[PDB]
Amino acid sequence: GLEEFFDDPKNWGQEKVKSGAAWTCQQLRNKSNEDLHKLWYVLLKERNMLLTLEQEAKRQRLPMPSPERLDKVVDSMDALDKVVQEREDALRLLQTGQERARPGAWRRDIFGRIIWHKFKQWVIPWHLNKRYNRKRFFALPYVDHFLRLEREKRARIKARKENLERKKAKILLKKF
Amino acid sequence: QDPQLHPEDPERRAAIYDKYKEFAIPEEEAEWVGLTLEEAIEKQRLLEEKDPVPLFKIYVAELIQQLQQQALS
Amino acid sequence: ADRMSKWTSKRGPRSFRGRKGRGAKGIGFLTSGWRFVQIKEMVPEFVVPDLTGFKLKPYVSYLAPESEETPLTAAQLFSEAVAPAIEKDFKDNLEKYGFEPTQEGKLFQLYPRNFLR
Amino acid sequence: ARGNEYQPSNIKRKNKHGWVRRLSTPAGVQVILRRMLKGRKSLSH
Amino acid sequence: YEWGVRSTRKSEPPPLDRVYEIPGLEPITFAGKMHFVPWLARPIFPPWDRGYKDPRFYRSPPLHEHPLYKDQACYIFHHRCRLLEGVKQALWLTKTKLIEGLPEKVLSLVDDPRNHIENQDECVLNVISHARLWQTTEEIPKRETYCPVIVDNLIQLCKSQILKHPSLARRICVQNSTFSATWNRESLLLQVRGSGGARLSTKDPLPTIASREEIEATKNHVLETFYPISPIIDLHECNIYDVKNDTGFQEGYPYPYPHTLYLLDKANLRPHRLQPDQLRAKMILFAFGSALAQARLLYGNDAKVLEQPVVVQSVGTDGRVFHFLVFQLNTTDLDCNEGVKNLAWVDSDQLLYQHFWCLPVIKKRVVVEPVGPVGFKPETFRKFLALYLHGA
RNA sequence: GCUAAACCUAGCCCCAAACCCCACCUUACUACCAGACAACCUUAGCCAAACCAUUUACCCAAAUAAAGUAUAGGCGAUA
RNA sequence: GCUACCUAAGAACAGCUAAAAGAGCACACCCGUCUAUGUAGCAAAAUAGUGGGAAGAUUUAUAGGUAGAGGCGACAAACCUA
Ligand SMILES: [Mg+2]
Ligand SMILES: [Mg+2]
Ligand SMILES: [Mg+2]
Ligand SMILES: [Mg+2]
Ligand SMILES: [Mg+2]
Ligand SMILES: [Mg+2]
What we know:
Chain A has 176 residues and is mainly alpha-helical. Chain A has five helices and two strands; from the N terminus they run αααββαα. In chain A, β1 and β2 form a beta hairpin. Chains B and C meet through α4 of B and α2 and α3 of C.
């Protein structure tokens, strides 16, 4: 029902709503996959209610009652997602040896930079994909000068930062 | 010494190989003759590309080895 | 003339505005006459459990004891899931213990992942 | 009489100065590379 | 001279890398990279199999492998075929003798004023005015709109005669019916796949117009030929076809007997519209096709002179000009040019009205021609009504 | 007495050392159909020669020295 | 994305006179003859009146193309983002 988008009617207008603590990753690691599945939707309904409260508080130009509830619920859902992701990652490592769920490759783009190209799903092979073959995964020799120039720009930034750090340290030593 | 040179004529094949004997080099070196740097990089990447072994196999081998050591000791 | 504002579907002429979307995943295809055929299997079906009788709540009592974070690892999962059976059968073909040589043939393939979330 | 030389049209703008046209030639790729080196927020139009 | 310039022809693939010509070594290609690079060999990709299978990405097999492909090439006449020789070609194809004017048997059905519709001219004028002027909010309706409207309203006006003729209850005008008939003509196998529209079906077959004596007299008539034009010209020469005779309906259909085929040339553009001669030829061919399908369904698939000839009528109109046809199929032995021949009575270029003024022409602020039809001819509607009433 | 006036570190310069989730080439930042086009090729000129026309130093792979020497050069500017 | 020319596919052209017109008068529309105003202006070329064309070698929207010793030009060395 739509009443689940709002807090308990007794709490409407209360300046403060007492709430427990956010689920922790370790606490969630003890729960079953089914238990995590159900807790995900419990937390999702709570999150929807809290977002509704936040938006209505903005609309009414009033402070949100106990805004830390939203932070707690977001942290709990993040922890649940991390726990499920850990379990899936461990299973994937065990059964395939792949440290990453999505296929990809290190490729050099048209600008000479090394990127992690994440693969996409296609129905036809790459040598037939017309749009894919327009994309260039190589850098022609005119990019080498710009690669050197970018490297030297990075080097200048790093040298400035390190010199500034050393000078600040010397100033602190002189002060104290 | 590929037998595909004039198959069904081993004497002719051996004659050709003897004629050009002095240039023979190990196959591990002949595989890389005349390769550009990019071709060589691609060849090496193909040589050393291996789908990762599932950690299941590694952990099973390690556990069996550890159990063998425990049984022996 | 506005180079900085994000390119959205609200900006170009009619063809541009029709062609560009907002990130919503496709649900079907377009046939002759611009008739949209919606594929049921393309629509994400929400697998919502029955929450009746569930004891967990969005928050945890502060009375709960503190613990140390121990992220699950492949080694830990193997030890807690496969090592007991391996030991019991070694004291007395890895598919019997759970390992599958290939993900092909499964509905939920672990790599390349073919399921949502 | 003069001054209104800009008669905007997004089709012409994208077809003339867009990312795809810039990448379509080695010279335009170097245009993008120069903008990236300078740190331009807007690489193409 | 060859058609299609080189610059438009598909570009020749680049020459193969010389590395592929050297027997002993495996070329290093960018296939492993999964993307093109210009400094590696171009892979030779095996042809991809799973492609032309998905319904929305399907490639039909070559015509040779289709189930109905046949080495003998049939010549099909469909709704969008325009005979070069027109009526002569249709007569040769159908082994038919032409008779100018509708037969007296049908023409007499409207001689008596009882069959004449009360307020006939008024109702027909209202039909023409609605079709050509009053049909839409637009000032001048197009032919695509006023041809079907004029035909349907004329059919309704004729159907109003159910008062005098209760036999008109045993008929119905079906739409989108499609028939197919195959037959041989001098070792040439011809098919007609008539689609058209507005097939008037009746529960009872039409009475024969020509007597046995006239049908036999058709033997002496020589089937006119045209040279060097082959009778096959403008017919779709197709190797994929079905020789089955289809009447367009499942067995057991009430109203099985065709009565009138209403063919309408409603294209807005003159080049997309049939010439009157080609329309008459199409009428001949469709009437013959429906009659032949009926004959093959009734008296079996045997080439013979029909003891009971099959009569099919047709009205082919462009919205203003009408052509009336009564076709008597009295032989399924079409292969030879000799013997009794089918016979068709045709009345040609019967114009319902000479012209229609949608706008009042004004010269020097004076109305010369008022809005409405000019040169209305009730005789053509009399012939239309006679054709409708035939068999009732 | 208004406007102002003043301030010191935000950083910067030169050295040394050290080698540095999702989306996006289609109208980029756009989940999802038949590829194939795929790159390579002397710099020139300003300028000096008081014009200019041959000519006129330019990341080299040990600084110094040999030595601005041998050489080159409208045997001249210069190299 | 101005402008010059071109390509593809569009659109507009009242009324009267005349009768199938690079026809007449004259709206829309295009232009810019003459005068006046304006001259850091409303405007880095405008305004008001007047005037030329206004079914054509017309005007015009959209997309595309030709690039600098080059383009384009019913040649004014005109135009190619004041
Ligand atoms: Mg414009
Ligand atoms: Mg000089
Ligand atoms: Mg006019
Ligand atoms: Mg004129
Ligand atoms: Mg001009
Ligand atoms: Mg001149």
